[PDB]
Design a protein around this ligand. Structure first.
Ligand code: ACV
Ligand code: W6Z
Ligand code: FE
Length: 328
């Protein structure tokens, strides 16, 4: 298997005021987005070792009782308001992965979209503070840390596309972003049940099949265990692990807005019998956010795509991904 070209890009100028240095970062984002569609953001300022420490403490502390009490409606019919946020249980013998998803901490009971019961907005559920001391506070702060990195990355993508640096970020706001964090646990199992292993057409053993992301961009931390592959013209290629950087790729909303100039790369998760963490942040805009599609390969920049509101995109995309690749 070929090693995929996944450059390491120092994104630290995107936090500062050196506009020429920011354009040199934007060029690197442009190049990576036009090639394999993946890069590692380095010098990103986030303490990922502590993220891993706190997530591990959670995954290793949580009990079967708590998992039912936090479970999304796919696992617990009592929790009809929990579509996105909460616990996604494993099924021993059948489904190995388990995870905990949370949304914008500003989606509180008094938030206008929660009052309205607008789809894709939910109030987060949390375990009991006494059983998981500090976890909720850590997780909410992590949301804002990775929100900050993502805002910076979005300035880079905007400049890369010939736009002003606020072009995406003006739609990515603390009060209404639909962005989510998922704390995924992939277990070591001995024996590992075959029913929890999928097989690709090319014979590769998988934990999660080929897909494009439902996101504007995806901002991912993972353990130092190689598992991801990206489809290129030369076939599926291995993405090297780097548990110091964030792996960045575009989702299909970016592909829509740019008329596939920045494609949403097809990728999949190899089966690995290893205890590891996968911690994506899906960079989603607000429910009513709508960016007019354009084409940076066309002189007048015009596109034959129709505008699509982010809330429409997200609600439909998350259902479709479950139907295609299964309930996580
Ligand atoms: C590839 C990783 C990001 C990870 N896969 C994933 O997280 C997969 C594919 S991107 N993502 C999903 O299923 C969408 C979860 C959306 C989330 N519940 C939300 O409501 O916002 C894995 O390690 O399996
Ligand atoms: C969580 C971690 O394994 O990355 C370390 F090194 F911080 F302990
Ligand atoms: Fe993905």
């Amino acid at each position: 298997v070929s090693k995929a070209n996944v450059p390491k890009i120092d994104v630290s100028p995107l936090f500062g005021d050196d506009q020429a240095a920011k354009m040199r970062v934007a060029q690197q984002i442009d190049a990576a987005s036009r090639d394999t569609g993946f890069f590692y953001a380095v010098n990103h300022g986030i303490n990922v070792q502590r993220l891993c420490q706190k997530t591990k403490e959670f995954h290793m502390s949580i009990t079967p009782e708590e998992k039912w009490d936090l479970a999304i409606r796919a696992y617990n019919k009592e929790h009809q308001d929990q579509v996105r946020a909460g616990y996604y249980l494993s099924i021993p013998g059948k489904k190995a992965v388990e995870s905990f998803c949370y949304l914008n901490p500003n989606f509180t009971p008094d938030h206008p979209r929660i009052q309205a019961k607008t789809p894709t907005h939910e109030v987060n559920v949390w375990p009991d503070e006494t059983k998981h001391p500090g976890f909720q506070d850590f997780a909410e702060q992590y949301y804002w840390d990775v929100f900050g990195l993502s805002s910076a990355l979005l300035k880079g993508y905007a400049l890369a596309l010939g736009k002003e640096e606020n072009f995406f970020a003006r739609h990515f706001k603390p009060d209404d972003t639909l962005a989510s964090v998922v704390l995924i646990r992939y277990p070591y199992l001995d024996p590992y049940p075959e029913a929890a292993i999928k097989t690709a057409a090319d014979g590769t053993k998988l934990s999660f099949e080929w897909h494009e992301d439902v996101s504007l961009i995806t901002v991912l931390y993972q353990s130092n265990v190689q598992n991801l592959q990206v489809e290129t013209a030369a076939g599926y290629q291995d993405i090297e692990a780097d548990d110091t950087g964030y792996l960045i790729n575009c989702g299909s909303y970016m592909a829509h807005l740019t008329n596939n100039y920045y494609k949403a790369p097809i990728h999949r998760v190899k089966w690995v019998n290893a205890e590891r963490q996968s911690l994506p942040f899906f960079v989603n805009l607000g429910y009513d956010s709508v960016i007019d599609p354009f084409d940076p390969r066309e002189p007048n920049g015009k596109s034959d795509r129709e505008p699509l509101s982010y809330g429409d995109y997200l609600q439909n995309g998350l259902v479709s991904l479950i139907n295609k690749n299964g309930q996580t």
